[PDB]
Design an enzyme around this catalytic site. Sequence first.
Site, mmCIF file in Angstrom:
data_model
loop_
_atom_site.group_PDB
_atom_site.id
_atom_site.type_symbol
_atom_site.label_atom_id
_atom_site.label_comp_id
_atom_site.label_asym_id
_atom_site.label_seq_id
_atom_site.Cartn_x
_atom_site.Cartn_y
_atom_site.Cartn_z
ATOM 1 N N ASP A 1 -7.383 17.126 -18.167
ATOM 2 C CA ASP A 1 -6.960 18.300 -17.408
ATOM 3 C C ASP A 1 -5.810 18.954 -18.180
ATOM 4 O O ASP A 1 -4.692 18.434 -18.198
ATOM 5 C CB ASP A 1 -6.549 17.921 -15.982
ATOM 6 C CG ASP A 1 -6.065 19.072 -15.113
ATOM 7 O OD1 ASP A 1 -6.144 20.226 -15.565
ATOM 8 O OD2 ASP A 1 -5.612 18.798 -13.985
ATOM 9 N N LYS B 1 -1.251 28.564 -21.312
ATOM 10 C CA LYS B 1 -2.597 28.687 -20.764
ATOM 11 C C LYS B 1 -2.824 30.079 -20.154
ATOM 12 O O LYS B 1 -3.958 30.538 -20.082
ATOM 13 C CB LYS B 1 -2.812 27.595 -19.716
ATOM 14 C CG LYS B 1 -4.203 27.541 -19.103
ATOM 15 C CD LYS B 1 -4.396 26.306 -18.271
ATOM 16 C CE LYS B 1 -5.665 26.318 -17.450
ATOM 17 N NZ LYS B 1 -5.811 25.059 -16.688
ATOM 18 N N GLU C 1 -12.763 23.473 -13.678
ATOM 19 C CA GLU C 1 -11.813 22.644 -12.919
ATOM 20 C C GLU C 1 -12.375 22.287 -11.543
ATOM 21 O O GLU C 1 -12.365 21.118 -11.167
ATOM 22 C CB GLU C 1 -10.463 23.357 -12.803
ATOM 23 C CG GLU C 1 -9.626 23.244 -14.066
ATOM 24 C CD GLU C 1 -8.515 24.268 -14.225
ATOM 25 O OE1 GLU C 1 -8.138 24.908 -13.224
ATOM 26 O OE2 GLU C 1 -8.029 24.419 -15.360
ATOM 27 N N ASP D 1 -7.522 24.877 -4.616
ATOM 28 C CA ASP D 1 -6.678 24.312 -5.675
ATOM 29 C C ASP D 1 -5.316 25.016 -5.678
ATOM 30 O O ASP D 1 -5.199 26.138 -6.172
ATOM 31 C CB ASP D 1 -7.369 24.410 -7.040
ATOM 32 C CG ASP D 1 -6.692 23.602 -8.138
ATOM 33 O OD1 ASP D 1 -7.417 23.069 -9.003
ATOM 34 O OD2 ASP D 1 -5.446 23.540 -8.143
#
Length: 380
Positions: free
Chosen positions: A8, A70, A175, A198
């Site tokens: 991850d 990211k 994800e 999430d």
Amino acid sequence: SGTVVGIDLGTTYSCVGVFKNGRVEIIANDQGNRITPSYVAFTPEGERLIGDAAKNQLTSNPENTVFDAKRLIGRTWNDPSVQQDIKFLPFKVVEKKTKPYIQVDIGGGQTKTFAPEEISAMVLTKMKETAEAYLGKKVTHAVVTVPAYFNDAQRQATKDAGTIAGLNVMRIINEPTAAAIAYGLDKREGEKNILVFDLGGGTFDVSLLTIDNGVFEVVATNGDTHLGGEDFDQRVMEHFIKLYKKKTGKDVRKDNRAVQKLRREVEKAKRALSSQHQARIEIESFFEGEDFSETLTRAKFEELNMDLFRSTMKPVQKVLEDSDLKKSDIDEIVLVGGSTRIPKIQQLVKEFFNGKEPSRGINPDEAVAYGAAVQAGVLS
């Protein structure tokens, strides 16, 4: 392939796992933490720091500590997303070949410009080295997770980051799908609809997945890219700073040191309030050799963040609309990210779906790495 690892590669935190003896083992780094901050920094000296060490010196090096790479990875300079995010980031971002690059100081007033890929590669190398230490052998291959909304460029950039770290990224996997795999939802029969919720440290992602014959598909996505656990901390910070000035008469804002001491205890208290109803926050010699002694109740914490908590439901309703589904058509609910431990978040999700229980059993900080490690287990 050897022993392939599941990674991850998160915006704020990264996590690494492996499949052995018919189970997932999430690997602790050399500081004993199962998660590792996606942080890179350089000291006044030449020393390069990755992970916990980088995040701990953030305070004393606020302009040359890289994070949230990211957000930039695989995007162009003209991308509206990039131009929004550079206003929230303390370190300097600049155009080079119509793409965003991160400029930082090494040491002794020497500057250097890295691509997002190179920053992510450094973080990946740290996860790689973490895994190597646990396994006792070199790791060449990995399964890396990315957000569902990532395009081809962003997916490829993530692969490139792997390559630089000496990792052959076998599969890129979404994800929410990884989280679904962690909960064994791929073993379910027939056709089902899955809502993944999430809520990380600085990002919120909702995904509607289908499953058909043990195979997933991302139907629609939504959320908020600047909503997470840190925003809940900030409301608590704002509350207690105001309370301190009201009682003592002292403004603490311009003392960077004291403010960090408070953020540390606020973060600890927030986590405690997921299982308790109150948490004392005591800091001796807090500001001008004067102590801080207050309590944060779950009720107060909820009160300070109620509007933010309720705002998470609008994306959930929107993805259902774009999927052309009703509330009652959802068969599985998966909560991912540390902020989903908050009782009020769980209740709001539960109530929106007319009393339906979310899945439980997996550490929500680790669920995505878990799923990646299972896929790695298959490819080992």
